[model samples]
Structure formats: structure tokens, C-alpha cells
Target chain A: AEEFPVPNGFESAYREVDGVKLHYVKGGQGPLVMLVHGFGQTWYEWHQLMPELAKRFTVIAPDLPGLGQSEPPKTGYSGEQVAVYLHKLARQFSPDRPFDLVAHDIGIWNTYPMVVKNQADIARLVYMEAPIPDARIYRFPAFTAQGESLVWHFSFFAADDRLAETLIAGKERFFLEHFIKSHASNTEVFSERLLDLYARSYAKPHSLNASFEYYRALNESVRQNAELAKTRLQMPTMTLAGGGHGGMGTFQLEQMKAYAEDVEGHVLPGCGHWLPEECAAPMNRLVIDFLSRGRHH
Target chain B: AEEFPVPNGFESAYREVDGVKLHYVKGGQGPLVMLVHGFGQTWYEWHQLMPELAKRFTVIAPDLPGLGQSEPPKTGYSGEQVAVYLHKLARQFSPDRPFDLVAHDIGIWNTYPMVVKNQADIARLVYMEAPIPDARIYRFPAFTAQGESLVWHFSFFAADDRLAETLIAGKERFFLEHFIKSHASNTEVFSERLLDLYARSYAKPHSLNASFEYYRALNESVRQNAELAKTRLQMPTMTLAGGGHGGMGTFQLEQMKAYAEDVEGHVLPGCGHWLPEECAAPMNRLVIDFLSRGRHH
Candidate 1:
């Protein structure tokens, strides 16, 4: 086996799909799985999980539209919208095969509307520690008010592009603290090296604005998902959450079940928000089970 | 007695000291004890200790030269140089009476040069969890090299004026994190409100540049103190370390004893780098003991 330090074989390639230059990382072989990461983090978060998943499946993790290394299209990029774009990218990657979908946090949130609307051809789906919004749970005074003020990222995902850029420029750590690392037991879990990586990435000109736009798109995704969920979802889905207190499992499971026809949920014990890093074994188990379940004739 | 909540009878006025406007808050009524806070923090850090210290002695806590509500001076504000400037500020507050000095973290480093050089008229002194820079400790490659990187804030403090201003402008959170909350365990220790106050204070255009120059001075102070340490500090001095392994106490304690005639050392148990908030009781006891020892003579 090659050493783990093997530099992720990270290739940055862009394809003009749906009139937008979408950046993606394509590696591995066998069955296909499109891997997506969360906000305040890039595709780099999938570093550990990607190689493992690569052994059994062709994994494609993209710097989502307008995030990471991807250039944001001038228009036409939301949950269902981006999924349509990715659908075209998937066709280009594998003309005949239907790919599995694996996503965490913002990626899951963005793709949910597409899955519900039946806009993308996803054979199996696995969501890690991502939120499932419901008016009862999310719209409550405590959650909504706190979400409105403290969780401004979610609110700003729909903000005007210019304003979003200005606000996010100086508040990179704010998102990293609240959305990314707050769930960790200590700062050591996310080391100085890891933090410096994110800081360096965000320090790139326009990177801050792009991150804010992700948050703004998140708010838009929530509104769009609400409208899309008016129709029933037919796909088999599995949602796994970090088991620690304050993880999404405590509140989001019921809403997720309400939205899908065949859905299963599990909370990985001792994990926080960063499920893949904190509780990789359970997530891997859930992923294998969900994918295997899809393959059985 | 008036209610303690009534601003604790703490009032501050700004003074023009060597062209910089320094703001300080003073309360109580007795022999003077000046409280110097670390980087990214203001006089408010001493809020808990202030009331208690004020009960016995007059407490004067100033937002350091480039921090808190103090106006950042245009020039000549390195750590050692700031020590000289602070000496002038200390004299302006009590030109006739010699006062006890209590300082923490960067504050201690800033004042060390003045006290060691005899330019500071400190009747009693307390160094709380500050870097104890002896040639043996700071001169070596292993300890100083590691510190040189971990303590980038120190380097930035020594940066050229224009570079300092620009850096401080671009990344306000980076400075605030290292100075106030980076060493802290719980956000509750400093609070969001308090963090915001510090962030806003430094975000004020030129304040950050002034703060960076202190780090610049720290390097200079290291060189300057090497020449000055031939004559030992004659004051009754005490140094304490945070027991949480954030400080090199063994070296720090030995360095203090090497330079001062009457020096005591203690460690705050269960505390990290944020010794002021984490171990205030022990810190207060250490200060009272050191000052009382001076009175016994």
C-alpha cells in the first residue's frame, strides 16, 4: 500500500458544464461516488475518507460551485440548480453508470432539494452530520432567533453578493469556530496546522466572499428545499449524525424521516460535528451498509 | 458602602504621555497598585480582581499603550520602548509616590526592561505568567525556536510601523485570538461580549499597528536586557507561572531569582495561560504577599 502521506493525488480540473466552469477532483476506480464537503472547509476535509472510499469506489469531490477552487457561475447555482450542473458533470465522467452520493454538512444541505425533487440520478445517499430543516424545529423562537443572530451564516447564504463579501472578509474565524470546530472537545482536535491551512486558504483574495456566499446559498437552499419538499422523495437515504450532545441527531432525525420515503438514522457515539474525523468507523459502516443495501437486487 | 455595580467607582481619564494619549481607570483609596493586562485585553480583564484589590489598596488599571480604549501613539512603541513609555505613564499617575506594579503575560515582558534598567520606580512588583526571558531560556534554539513560531504575535509586535498597521487592519480576529482567547479554555472565561469589545478596540484603524510594535520591541528588549542585566533588579519581585504547561516555569523562576534580590515564585494550579482569569485568587494572594513583604522593611 502506498504511504498515507501520498499527496491526495489532488488534481484541480475545470469543466464547462451547464455554461459554468465547475472545479472537481476525480480519482480512484470501480463504482462511482461523488463526495462533497461542508462550509468553512474545502474538499481537503475528505482527505482521510477519500482515499479509503477510493479503494472501493471512484470518488469525485468537488470544490462546490463558488467555493474552494471552483469559480462561481454568475447565476444558476443552488441546490437543485447545482445538482443539475453536477448531473451533467456526472454524465461526462460516467456516461452509463448511476453514481452514489456521499456528502457532509453544507453539501448534504445543498443536495437534499435535488434528491427530493428527483433532479439528480443518485443511486445511494449518505449524509454525515448535516442539518435537516423543519419549521417546527428550525423556526422555533430559540432556534430561529439564535439561528438568525448567532447562526448568521445560514441567514446570509441568501444575502446580496456584495454585502456577503464585505461581512465575511474579517469573520473567517467566526465561521470556523461556530460552524466548523465548536463541536470539538478541545482546540487540539483541530490543530494549529489544520487551522493555518484554512486561514491560508481563506486569506486568498475573494475566498472570504466565496465562503460567505456558501452561507447565503445555504439560506436559499433552505427556502428552495421547503418548496421542493412539497413533492415526495423516492430515493432510499441514510442520515448519520455525530453522537455528542448538540449534534444534529438530537433534533433533525424526525424532520428527515418526514421528508423521505425510506430513511434510516444513526448517531455515532462520542463524535462531534466533524463526524468523518471524529467517528470515521461508524460513518464508514453506515456508508457501506447504505451502499450495499442499494446494490441488492 | 455604595453598590459595587455602580461602575465600581472606577473612572478613567486620558493623559498625553510623550505624544500618545493613554487611558487608565482608577479606583479605591490607599497605596497605589497598577494592574497591567496582557495583549488583546483591556483594563476590564482586571474587573474581578479590581474590586477585591480596591478594597485594600488603590487599584489603577490602564488599557495598555496600544490596547483597550487607549489611543495608539504614532511612533517609538516597542516592548522595551513601551516599558520606558509606561514608566513615564506610571509617573504621570503618581509622580511623587512610588507604586506597586502587577503585570501579566505581554504586559510583564513590556515592563521588564524598565524595572531591570532602574528606569521604573516600582516599590513592589508581581510578574504574572509572563515570558521569563533569560539567555539560558530565550537564547537557546529548542525553547526559543518553538516559542519564536508559536509566539508570532511577539514578532508582529516588533514589526515596522506601516506593515504593523496593514497587518492589524487585514486580520483583526487573528490578533484578538492570540492575545485574549487563544490561550483560554472556555469562551465563557472571556465571553463573546468581552471578545467583541477587544476586537472592536483593535479594529480601530491604527490601534493594531501600535500593538504590533510591542512585539518588535520584545526582540529589542531581549537584546537590550542582555546588556542591562549586569546590575540586578533591587525591588521585591515575585513571578508566577500558569500550571497548565503553557509556560516554562522552571526557567522563568530561576531567571527571576537570578535577576532580583528579593524574589518569590509560585504556580497557579489548574490554570492555563490565562492565569489572570483562571487563577485570580492565587495571583491576588501572591501580589498581596509581595507588596506586604516590602512594607515589612
Candidate 2:
């Protein structure tokens, strides 16, 4: 991980809210842009796009609950709690200006409610790769090729008996690296260094349980989000999909349309689930222009 | 594992069929009685009951495909396939005598279809602790306290890209032991000797995958059973449920009634999912009497 350096002028910091010690990367000066990282990764999920996006707009890529340097969420890992915790973080720096919201995977899970409640003075939103936990997820068959491609872990992680954590407890790298490898259309997107780094991050105490809490608490989380979904996203939304093997394809976009008033779907033709790392160039260009606008998206 | 001796006069043996090496234990003199072991267990699952039952009848307890000393199944892990494979084994020994059918967990999955097809000239059946995969399994919620108590691994084991195989690559004991541990109401039922034995069995190359095959092939297995379900079970049957914490609590009985012609329900008051190990005395006494002069059950 030392081989990959932080972008120039950017620095790291932390904030504790509602008992969660939030860890994040901050730099640049313009319309505040907050980047939220997802599961199986840290804020470094934005590492490649971090510097490039920083060149144009202020970027603060933060680790979500129970990942990277962030302490496990003390309040809860629900999107409701994570959204509130993150909104407090955004209000810290967004000050008066509406911050641009960009998140991926479970990051999207945490941030979607923020936009819905107008929690952050949000300008634009960019989310990719994952669909929020809902009735749609339950509709999935147990053993379909398409279902197993990505949603395989949904049932496993949410499993009771702590079985996911039990099986994966000591085999973190084996699970994470293969998980990352299988989801990437471009196998080289996350190299040995990042794989090792992320693995070590999850290797921390209570990491796997904390990570799985999002899944274990899904019935409640989905119900909370269902209530949030009753109100459409006020900001113009741009949903990017990694349209390749194991990618959600237009699934994420389709999910977003149900909640967003104005939503645009952008498909990354050759990328897999790791949009920022696998298709960084296009993701950055598209998101930058979308956020740079005065109106949302 | 060596510390737990096989019953006094019983001998271990192997018979190869359809390119699969089936391992089993056999002894005693009387009516033919075939015992089938379930997932995470072996022919050893019948160790406690074998000797007693052998006194009254000739007994053979065989490890199902992909477990213990048996080679993985080449045909498939579907109930229909396992049913045929087992029936041939019974025919080799049963000659003309109708054999007794007693099984548990995935063992029930394998043997139910056998009884349905009258594949083994079966006289009676004592199946316990599991329901066949069908529309009932698909109706389960992804996360629920009751659901996670047992079916937690259903979604996980059927996962694609061999991710279940990937995550559990080296943590065999961590998984199977906890899996066995949590489902067991009687904590001491599986001692260190047995847990170590089961874990070592799964540690073999391709072992985990072979075990998961029962789940991976679930879609096909469920469909095949659905077709078989159109026909009804003719033999008298006893469905046993572990009525303790994580037990099915007569859920097995309810499932059997749909297909069974003369089905009786037995509930083990304080036992958990491992009916044989946790409630051996009753399971053995009840099964022996049930088979002695039965139309089944």
C-alpha cells in the first residue's frame, strides 16, 4: 500500500459523531465534493480518481462505517445512521455551499438517504455498482448464474449464526482478493498492493462482523430506506453502471430511477463492478462535468 | 477421530459405481437396513445407532456423495442422482430384501426421491432434521432471526464463481464447527474428536466444493424433486424434528406430510438439528422398532 501515495496536497483527518470515529481524506478548494467508499474497500477506492477529481473540485473521500481507519459504527450500520453520521461530516466542511455527493457500492447505500432528506446541502449525486437492499433483492433466485454473479454475497452476509464471519474470519485475504478479482472485468484494476492493503484493513479486530452488520441489519435498513424512498431525490442524479461480466449493468440505474426525480444512466461498457478503479478515466470526466454544473447533475 | 471407534463388529468397505467410490459401514444379521449420512458428517453419523440396530438387523451406513471417505459424485448432487447412486448400492447388498431407508439433513434430500421412485425396494424410512428444497426454500427471507437460525448457509453455499469455495478455502474448521456448534442445542454432542474429524474430512482438495455441490446444484435438485413430488411416497415414514433452539421443530414433519402416505411426526424435546448425535438413544430405539416389522416409518 505504501507504493501507492496519496494525491499531492491532499491530507487525512477524522471526526467523531454519534460515537463513530469517521476517517477521511481531504484536499482541494471549490464546490465541496464528498466521495464515499464501499464495502471490501476503504476511502482508497477513490485513490486513482481522487487526484484527478481533486484537480477540478474539492474532494473528501471518506471511509464508511467499520472500514479503513474508521471505527465501527457505534450507533448502527443502517443507511439511516450512516447517512446521518455522514451528513454531519459534510456539514462540517460544506459550510454554506451545497456539496457534491459521489459514492459507490455500499457507499451508495449510506448516501442515498442523505440526498432524499436533503441532509447535506447536496448539489449533484454520482453512485455506481450496487442496488440498495429491498424487495428486489429478495426476488433473486438462490442459485442462478446471473444472481450469483454479484448478489451471491447478499444472502450469505445477511445470514444468521455469524457463519459468514465464521468462515471468513481468518481467511480475509482469500475472500477479499477473490471477491475483488471476480467482480473486476479488468483483472488488473486492483493490483497485489491494493489487494494486500484492503485485506489488512479488514484484518483489523471486529472488522468482518462490523462489515457484515450492514447485511445482518438489512430488514430494518431496507424498511428505513423504504420510508426514505417515499420522497424522490431532489437533486439531479447521475447513476453509472459497470456493464460487464458480474457487473450490475443497468440494474443500479434501474434501481435509482425509482427514487430519483431526474436520473441519467451512464454505462461503462467494459468495466466490471469496480467503476472508479476499472474505468477511472471516463468516471472522472463524466462525474467532473456533471458536478461542475450549477444545477444538480 | 481414531479415538471414536466404529461399533465392535462393523467393518468399513467401499463400492464403486458410475465412477464414484461409495464408502460405508456394515455389520450384523437380519433385515436389510441402509443408513445415509448428511452434510458435514459421514458414515460415522450412524456410529451410535449402528451397533444396537445391527443386533436386530443387518445395518449399513454410507457416506453420501462428496463427504467422508467417499469420492465426490460424478453424475451430479441432485436428489434424483444421489437417489439412483444409493439405490444401486442397496441393490448390491439387499439382493431381494426391501431395505430400510433412514437419513438426515441433505441425506433426506437424497433419500426422499428414492422412496418416491421406489428405487431401492424400500420397506420403511426414518428421515430427520431437514426439508427438501422446493418452493418452500425459495420463500425464505434473506435475513430473519428464524431464517438465519438454520437456512443461513442455503444462500451462501449456492453462491457462484466458487466464491463460497474461495472464502472457505482454508477455514474449514472455522466454518463447519461453528455451523455444527450453533445448530446444536446440546453443546457437548460433538466433541473435539468429532469436530476435528469432520473438519479434516472437508480439508481435502475439492472437498469443500464437493460439499457445496449439494447446494450449487440446488436449482436442478429442487426442480428434479418437484417432478418427483408429482408422485407420492408409498412407504410408511417417520419425520423427526429437533425441537430445541435452532431445530426445525416439526417443520420437517410438516414438509413430509405433503408427500408421505403414512407419515408420523417425532419431535425431540431438547435436541437441536443433529438429531442422531444429540438424541441418539431415542433416535436409535425409535428407528429400530420403526423398521423391525414395518410397512415403513
Candidate 3:
């Protein structure tokens, strides 16, 4: 798979975590800060904020397995499996020091298990623009309006892989571009060059199938989240949403409040699903401020 | 629009009902059988059963407003409005004599208002593979499996008319054919010529928009059905479902039983959503037998 350009000064490498090779980028120095991205995005989604974040704390960003430069796992994309995979990545960075976590989309789903199961290793958490793991209904607000026009792809991606692959093959640029442009409040945030970069990675063989595997594993995640919801996390937690961009925003915060003892929330104005790209400044400020508040427990 | 071939003995005509011009075909003698067609179809959907039923009963089938040869109404495509419009057509058939009602697809939605408002004018009701007026949840079983891949169009059709029209404009044949073929257990039921006929009608200017009005009106239909459910219909009712088609079948009958005093439910095995064309023989036999049983009240 082709490696998309990363920010200058950032060092990148591959580490075998639990039999799966993971591609990650790290830069800066100080306390550890991990940034995880979700579907249709790579660690590059954190590029805008990476420099700012790195100035204050050491930053570690990894492409989820089977996405971007990461090799596709033979099997296992469940939240539990992903959390376990990420845990090993965390150990490689700082085996003893606890780190602050910042994650979006599927990144939130993957890291959630780590936070819930290994709370001691996480000082603070910032969840962005995706459903909370323990949400009673695992659907996005996009599905509730206009008979769910925005999320028709959910059903499509969750359908038979062969059929989806046939329809998506060779049209990766069109497919990814359409999704990125349509879902963003400011479509300009996705320039042709950047979209081309994403398409190159997403269009790779098995990329679409591996990406869709995230949706296919949603039911299992829902059940796993339900069991995890029974115990509340004690760490300080904050959830960010896109108000104008149709991001879950406050609604997700309401749900997250039920799962964390110390919880906070914010809505990034004039943003859509791509919170990092659309509201990089505000997101960076919020993350640094929230993480700097110091651990409560 | 181009005229599609009908049964040899059937005579076609247009009648203006409630400011909407309706295209209807009639044949045979004896008891009157009013056939109603639903979404993605017209009166022609009943062509297979018309000749057979005409041998024993008078068959009257009409296209729902803005569908098939029926002219689009200035407004009004809600279940209640369509029901009222079909009521006028039923009156023209027999002002005094009550007729046996046979309806399928969106035809079922249009005819429902007539049956509830003028129950005395309807003898036996044969409802086909769609939801009843007062179903608490107006969704198909197909939506429950595979992340609701089968009926994803319901949401798409209910989305913005301008966008839907743009996407469906030149692809009418491909759109209708995919729905018909994919949803049917026996795809052969929708012959090439027949699909071509439906496509011609559906491809007409403003046709896709008008057809989507049925789904746009679904929320209203659900509310209207909820109100209608409070007052039980005492007539003898039989609901037909496609066992293989994912049509209402026995599940719809279960819902009908809650709203009607006497309801008979049957599932045509090896059938899909297109009950009339997929299982014409059994559908005809079932209707004849059910109507012959007389009024239960």
C-alpha cells in the first residue's frame, strides 16, 4: 500500500501488535498523547492539530489495522479486538507512563474498550464526532432525518461484501470523494489533492472490504458496550460534536454522561463529521484545555 | 405516456376523481372486484390475475394517482387523499351494490380509506403484501435483516424530491428493474417487456417525484392508520403475503387481525413482494374463496 504524506518532523514506523502489524507516527516530547482516527480517515486526519499538540505533549497517532498503511488482519475487527490491538501500541510508546487519549469515529470505538478496561493507563479522554460505545441505539442522527438519506451507505456497506466490492471497485476516488464532500459542512476542507491522497489508500485491494468490516462488527460492539456500560469510568472524559455539520455533538454527550463520572461535552460550530479538519483550532484548544485539567481520580 | 398491453377482453378508460384523472381497466361480469396497485407499479401489475378473475367476477383495476397512465394530482397523494379519490372511482362502478375489494402495493394504501370510511359499500377485502392502515410500525420484515438492505429505497424515496429526481431521471429502467428483480423470489415473474412497460410509465416526467409522494406521505399514513385502528372494521378481511417475497404474508395478517374483527391470513410460498404476478393462480383462488365466504359481521 502507498504511504500518504505525513507532517514534517514526524517519525513513522511499523510495530507488530498482537500478531497484527500496525503503522503509526510519533513526534514531539513530554507526557504521551495518543490520537486515533476512524473510518474513511487515517492518522493524517490529526495532521492539522498534530503540530500544536506536539508542542505541548508527545503525540502518537496510528492508522487502525486494515486502514491506511496498516496491514489487514486475517480476522478480528471487533471493538474488543481493536482495543486489545491498540493497547499493545500504547505499550510500545511508554510502557509505564499513563497517556491522555484523543479519538474520533471508529477510533472512539476502538479506544473505548481500553479506557473502560485499563482506565489506570489513561489520564483523560476526548471522544469526537462518533457514537459512544454504550449508546442504546447505535445509529447516527443522520439516519433520523429525511428518512436517513445521509446514512444510506451504512446499509450498503453492511450488505454482501462481494456485491459492495463490485460496485465500489475502481470507483474509489468517486466514492470516497462523494462521502467526504457531502458529509462535510465546509466541503472545501476536502481539496482535490487531499481526496486523491485518501482515494489512493482507500482504493487499495481489500481496503473497501476491510473498512466495511467496521460496520459489520457494529452489532457485536453494541452488545459489548452494553456490558461495559454497567461500570462507569472514573477518568475525566469529554465528547466533541459538530453542530452545523450534523455531528452528534450534544446528544452524544448526554449519552456519554451516563457512562462516565466526570464528563464534559462541546459542539464545534460550523463543522460536520470531519471535526479535526473543519474545526482544528477550536478542537486543539478544547483537547489541550481538557487534558490539562489534571486527573480527577 | 406509452400504453402497455393489457388482457384481451379488458377495456381501459380514464375517470376524473377529485380533480385527478385516473386510468382504469375493467373486464368480466358478476361481482365487482376492484384491484388496486401500489408503489413502483400500476394497474398492469394485476394483468396476470385479471383475465382469470374476470372469468368468474367483474375486475376493475386503476392506477394510483401520478402513477402509470394516471395523471398527477395538483397536490394530495396521502393515503387518506388517495383513498378518497379511489372511493369516487368505486362509486362510479356501483353506486348501490357493494363490491369485493382487491388491492396490492400502494393500491392497498389508496383503497384503505375507502374501506374504512364506507365499510358498508365494500363486501370482502383482500389486502396484499403491504402494511395495513394502523400498523404501529410501518416497516417491512426485509428491513430487519442485513442492516435493512432490501427496503433502503423507502428512505431514499422519502428524501429530497429534487435530489431523488436527479438520480432517478435517466436511470428509470435500471432503478425499477433492480427493485423488481432483487425483491422477487422468482425474478422471472418480471419479464423484460413488463419491466420495460413499468419503466416507461415510471420514467415519465415528474413520475419518480409523484411516486415518492407515497413514501413522503407515510408518516401521515401512520398517524391516520393509528386513528383508524381505534374503530375496528367488522368486514371479512383476508391479507396475502409472499412467503419468499418478503411481502406482508402472515405478519401483515397478524397486524390486520388487531384492527379487524374477522381476518384471514395466507402466505403464498415461493413468492416475493410482487404477489399478483409472482403467485397469480393462488392469489386469484384465495381471493375468490375468501370473498365467497361472505361478510363475517
Best by TM-score: 2
Clash counts for the predictions, in order? 11, 2, 10
Tell how far residue A111 is off in model 3, in angstroms: 3.5
Where is model 1 more than 4 Å wrong at Cα?
A1-297, B1-7, B132-150, B156-179, B185-187, B245-248
- Per residue, candidate 3 scores C-alpha lDDT tens digits across A112-171 of 887898888988889987776443442332223234445566555655524345555666
lDDT per model, in order? 0.63, 0.79, 0.76
Candidate 1 docking class: incorrect
lDDT of 3 by residue, B227-256 (tens): 776678888888888888545556778878
Please report, as a residue range, the 10-residue window in candidate 2 chain B with the lowest summed lDDT.
B140-149
TM-scores, all candidates, are 0.49, 0.81, 0.76
Candidate 2 lDDT score at position A62: 80
Distance from true location, Cα of A134 in model 3, Å? 6.3
Docking quality tier of candidate 3? incorrect
Error of 3 at A247 (Å): 3.9
Pick by lDDT: 1 or 2, better one: 2
How high a TM-score does candidate 3 get? Answer: 0.76
TM-score of chain A of 1: 0.82
Model 1, span B166-212: residue lDDT tens: 43466675546544543543335666665666677767666665566
Ranking by lDDT: 2, 3, 1
Candidate 2 local lDDT, B1-297, one digit each (tens): 332357889888889978899888899888778988888888888898888888878889887877777788888888888888898888889877788889888888887777788744978888888888677776554444323425647756776667677777677887787788778899797888789888888777667788888887777777788888998887778888889876888688898889878889889899999988999998777887778765322
In model 2, pairs of residues that clash are B124-B296, B236-B297
When candidate 3 is compared with the true two-chain complex, its DockQ is 0.21
